[PDB]
């Protein structure tokens, strides 16, 4: 039971870390072109989605 609980906790932790890393990389990919240019008329769906 301890092994199963530890495995479940590790799976949850790695899944959350992977989701956070993918979201942050998506933010980098979809935001860095607009941060190097003036007047970033950005549809706010992306920033609102991945800001939190």
């Amino acid at each position: 039971t301890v092994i199963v609980l530890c495995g479940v906790a590790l799976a949850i932790l790695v899944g959350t870390a992977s989701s956070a890393a993918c979201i942050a990389k998506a933010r980098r990919d979809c935001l860095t072109p607009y941060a190097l240019a003036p007047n970033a008329t950005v549809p706010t769906a992306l920033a609102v989605l991945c800001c939190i």
């Binding site: 860095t32 941060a35 190097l36 008329t41």
Partner: protein, 153 residues
């Protein structure tokens, strides 16, 4: 160009030319070194590796003295520290042999003292040299335009 285009120094050699545009400093990622200005050495550089660049926010004093971004690029001759650069068919070219290593980050200048593109590298195609650069877009998208065979200076 002379006043507000700061070389990057390293081992007593200039490796590039970091440029302050629109209130933000930019420095090509492929080149390595230290910035001569003391103020610029204290800025945190966020790295966009996919465009081979890092950018940071200039301090309050130097925001007012910066070159001007642009979007409109009619084809023709444009200014450059080494002379004139020909823009045609959505491509930047220079006379063969001009420029080289240590010139990365140099901003191409417009007639009205406005920056059009930043030099990253150059590919020699025999007759001319095609410049691998980063250009702007009408929707404010920084397109990294690199012709085949480009070499990062």
């Amino acid at each position: 160009e002379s006043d507000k285009t700061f070389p990057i120094m390293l081992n007593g050699q200039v490796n590039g030319y970091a440029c302050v545009v629109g209130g933000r400093l930019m420095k090509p990622l492929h080149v390595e070194g230290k910035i001569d200005n003391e103020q610029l050495a204290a800025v945190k550089l966020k790295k966009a590796s996919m465009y081979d660049l890092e950018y940071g926010d200039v301090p309050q004093n130097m925001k007012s003295d910066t070159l001007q971004y642009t979007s409109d690029k009619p084809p023709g001759f444009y200014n450059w520290h080494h002379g004139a650069v020909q823009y045609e068919n959505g491509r930047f070219t220079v006379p063969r042999g001009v420029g080289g290593k240590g010139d990365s980050g140099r901003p191409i200048l417009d007639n009205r003292g406005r920056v059009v593109a930043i030099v990253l590298g150059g590919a020699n195609e025999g007759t001319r040299t095609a410049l691998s650069v980063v250009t702007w877009n009408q929707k404010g998208v920084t397109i990294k335009d690199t012709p085949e065979g480009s070499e990062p200076w």
